[PDB]
Write a protein that binds this ligand. Sequence first.
Ligand SMILES: *Cc1c(COP(=O)(O)O)cnc(C)c1O
Ligand SMILES: *Cc1c(COP(=O)(O)O)cnc(C)c1O
Ligand code: NA
Ligand code: NA
Lengths: 375, 375, 237, 237
Amino acid sequence: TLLNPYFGEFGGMYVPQILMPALNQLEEAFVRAQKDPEFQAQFADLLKNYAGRPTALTKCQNITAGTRTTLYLKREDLLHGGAHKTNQVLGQALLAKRMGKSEIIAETGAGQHGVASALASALLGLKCRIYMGAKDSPNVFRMRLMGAEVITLKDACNEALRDWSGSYETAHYMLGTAAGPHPYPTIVREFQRMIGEETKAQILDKEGRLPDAVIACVGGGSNAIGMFADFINDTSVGLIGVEPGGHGIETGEHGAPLKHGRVGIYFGMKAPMMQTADGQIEESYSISAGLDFPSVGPQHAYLNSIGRADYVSITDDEALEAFKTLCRHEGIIPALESSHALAHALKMMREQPEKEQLLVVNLSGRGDKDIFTVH
Amino acid sequence: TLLNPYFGEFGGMYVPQILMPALNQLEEAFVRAQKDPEFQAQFADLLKNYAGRPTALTKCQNITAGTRTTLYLKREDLLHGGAHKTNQVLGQALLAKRMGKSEIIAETGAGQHGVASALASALLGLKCRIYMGAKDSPNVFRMRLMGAEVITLKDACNEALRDWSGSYETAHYMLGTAAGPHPYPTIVREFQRMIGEETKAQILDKEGRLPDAVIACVGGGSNAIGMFADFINDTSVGLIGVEPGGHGIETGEHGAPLKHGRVGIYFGMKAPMMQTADGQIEESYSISAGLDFPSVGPQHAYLNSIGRADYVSITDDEALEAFKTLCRHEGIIPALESSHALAHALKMMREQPEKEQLLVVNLSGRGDKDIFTVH
Amino acid sequence: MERYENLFAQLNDRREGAFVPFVTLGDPGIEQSLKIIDTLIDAGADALELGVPTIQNANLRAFAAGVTPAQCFEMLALIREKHPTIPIGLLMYANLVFNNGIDAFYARCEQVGVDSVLVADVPVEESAPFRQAALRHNIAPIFICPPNADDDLLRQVASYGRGYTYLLIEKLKEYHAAPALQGGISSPEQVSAAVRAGAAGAISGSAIVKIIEKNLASPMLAELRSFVSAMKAASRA
Amino acid sequence: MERYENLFAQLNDRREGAFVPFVTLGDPGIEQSLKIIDTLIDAGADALELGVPTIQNANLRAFAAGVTPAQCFEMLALIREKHPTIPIGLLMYANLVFNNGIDAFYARCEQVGVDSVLVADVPVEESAPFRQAALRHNIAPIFICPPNADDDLLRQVASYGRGYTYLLIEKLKEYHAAPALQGGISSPEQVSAAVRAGAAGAISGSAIVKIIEKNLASPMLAELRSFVSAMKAASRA
Ligand SMILES: *Cc1c(COP(=O)(O)O)cnc(C)c1O
Ligand SMILES: *Cc1c(COP(=O)(O)O)cnc(C)c1O
Ligand code: NA
Ligand code: NA
């Protein structure tokens, strides 16, 4: 391969031989695009005039009141689609095109991805077929409406992989997060790296100083790593990832394999996972289905291994509260998934009010979708 | 008064004497703020880092394919709240503050405004009470959640006016559109004028030439006039307003008083209205409740009188189609209200494909709210 | 217009205040209202305050009684037919008087026997068209003078007004404003309270409308008889 | 490992191809599977292809039969207990063999009597750990050789592989790759088709699994008896 399919001991390409050529072709197509000023130009242009980039950096001044910590917010919810997802999905599509693809393959549980793919497909004109199980509504319609072809997850991931296996010549696979087999993990990060880059330049302007720490929820790690990336080299600023603790780690009904899983081999990669005592892959509970990935990004497992990044957790109630709080004090409705992250920042300041800290959480999306449930 | 409460023969301050001092105070507070570089600074700043401004100008390239007309789109849906409303609501709030107000009064039918007010109230910390009737859901919760105090329209407008009448000393009234009595019509335009200003600069960049025409739907005229304003002096570019034709003008079940109403006196203003043969105010049908205002902006009635602006109409089916079309060809879901406007542009090009025209419609909002119905 | 003048004449020659009871036209329905007014009148009422479709419920009530803007002018004539002296006031909103021409309306008013008209939504700052058209057809344009009043507002209502002022009492007099009429009167105490206060009389708004809705199923009149009688007696001196 | 060698010896001394039928371990449940294999074996089967929990339904079936990774190794030993010669192949996924140590797994394999193991998700590019650990414990690491094969891929599977190649036939031989075994075989025609094609034999995947699910309520064996018998006869020569 051209790139390093491994982040420490996490990563690899654990997929049937049949899919290796597909993957090899993809890394070649990516390494090429990566250096093409044109590809960049379009992607950048598309991000700009269609998606909405750059995203604003709102500075919360009400919730922090009473404490000595300033909370900045990265408005990934002010982006077309209302979620960071509709970001890398474009670059992948552009990639699919550069490769000569005429169709897109994807899957989803809630539909958040099924939409991004659909919306990205429609604009770029690509035949897109999404895979959904029983969790299958407002998006099924949303997806179909957008031309998409609606057809657990680990299972839904197989069907997808199966399909692609025999068709990759024309159809391309759109991984939903920064997980899966190489070079996906590396691809989705690059197509989500502007988030941190913008965050850096922005904060540098508003406070001529880098943040103390940057919090970001983690379902697969795509949004998290998107924010982290450009700050890795900046040792001063800390990186905090937040996994869904569900009803509580000590209850077993949670979703934080990164810190309570156990490295295994599935999803074409080698990283921490939610599995039984003898190797059976399991689920990951959380109020926000947008965070039900029973695994995590290999670069996240590695970043935490060398202690470069700290990963904490947050239960349902914690997020549910941080959710209502944002509404009432900032007039912003965050995604139950995004809450988790913001919910940790609150605790961070609440526990040490006299503590002077300038942190910024990543708001990966709006909460309009979780309004029904949170209700 | 300091300003001109009249646009030709349309306008005025037809409200009980009791409310005159309130109005007089408001115009004074506005004329003052208008020239305060600070007030501007904040408003601008708030618009920027909180709401999302500037809004992108997406250039549709798929729907126009097959014809000689380029369709540009003003992404008012990429704004916090997913509608142009969450724009003037801020400046009004800032105004309320500058005046010393601690509470906000408002009303709504669907809730679109009730939210903007709520969201604007919360951020600026103002006690807000919205008035709703029976049409009263996802927003009632959305509103309450945001601290708002949930309590027809012409009727709902009275209750509101009644309240304010005896309390204006502390509470301020937040008109929902560019209608009502002076200086509201003039106020809401100024707090919605950046839309066109941005549109001008943007198009001037993308095509170093002003648009041929600018389409915008009209429920009250706030979004329309927001887009029109900065182009009025530009005689070359045409201004097209689109009122909801409902089931069809010839059916009586429509909502276009501007061109099929009859000047009357209500809502504290003198302009076209939906009334019976002997003066009784009526309703205005349309699939999009966000366009059920039985009247219109006096400056719109005047602009059309001197023939400066052209106003057309569009039925439900027309919008319903222009709706699904945007989804499938641009991956964008527009508001059923915004459809109407875009639905006219389509017809404009469909009828004369060989016709070379560069027009831009105003997308006042996302369609996520109308997804249930359109379904 | 001169009707009010007359009323404030004999009323003074008796050192007593005026008691004008308000009510919605054709509220209960039509024949009942035509009666309520009859009673209100012989009950003691000096003037009249008829509104065209609590007060809210009054409208809702009337409405559900098929009361078109034409059905009232019928009553207005009928009423005037039996009572040529009692002054009649009309409460309206711009659109109604604006609907089919401003003058046409006022002209129709002089035709039925209306004396004064007050447009609830027409401030002194936008009454010109209504003022002139009213004067032209010999109709007293009544303007409301609220609490948050001014000096200029006080001067405007005293100059533009006529028939009577809808309520200071010293300045309104100093300015020469038509006999001010105070209008939260529900008890005889307030009636005499105003008279002594300086007001040429008082008006009982919804106050009487209630008595009509608290007996909707019991054609009430006796209650109006007394209620008014009382109120009236309180004005005497 | 040497078990396969032996099989491909007597098999050649009879100028006949090998017929390895695949099936899910403890599919129907446990005792039934322990039987199906018994039959498959005496029916004619030369080798064996046992997968650990159409094929999908096979898993779903077994699962609902309480078949833990420990319950199979029990069967693997039992089976081997009665059949010391027939080679046994295992179909697994990285995580399972990785779970409780890679070596530990392979070591347990040599302990039960397994001959070859193929990890469906372990490409030649990430098999080192699995390859060595397999060889170390005398286990033939079977690698799949698909259609979109290469020259290097052909060279890699011929060098790293052992026991037999999971299927060109000329290059695989030129490279010295363990006897290639072709595996879409459902009719005796394809069986003999492969033999003649150059393949040392064929494998009937789900092909046989169906016969097991199309009689789920009728303990079927007779169908497997014949189905296999046929398939086998087709390989003879
Ligand atoms: C999809 C989604 C996530 C989960 O994404 P990662 O791949 O874990 O970054 C988090 N927040 C929102 C709003 C999402 O839509
Ligand atoms: C509220 C709304 C409108 C109607 O607003 P005007 O005052 O008529 O501009 C139109 N489109 C959207 C998306 C709206 O939210
Ligand atoms: Na996860
Ligand atoms: Na309208």
